[PDB]
Amino acid sequence: KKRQRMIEVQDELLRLEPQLKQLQTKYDELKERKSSLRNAAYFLSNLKQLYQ
């Protein structure tokens, strides 16, 4: 069980690192993808909707 505890913590350390990287990627992708187009494709087309 103690060896199993070390293995699970090793998975738990790996799981923690993977979840931290995945959540960092999640926040970055959320911000970039969700807000860029809703602001760029909005404004760039709204600027086109303005100027053109």
Binding site: K1, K2, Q4, R5, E8
Partner: protein, 48 residues
């Protein structure tokens, strides 16, 4: 009855520790109590 008891001695000794067995048996008994404590500790910690 004492002669017959020496007879019991001569009867079962041929055919076939104790204080140390008793003391170390008790010692291992609380050692295994501490052990089931470590088991509930390790099992519950592994479960969480």
């Amino acid at each position: 009855h004492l002669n017959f008891l020496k007879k019991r001695l001569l009867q079962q000794c041929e055919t076939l520790k104790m204080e140390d067995l008793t003391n170390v048996s008790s010692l291992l008994n609380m050692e295994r109590a501490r052990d089931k404590a470590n088991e509930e500790g390790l099992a519950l910690l592994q479960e969480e």
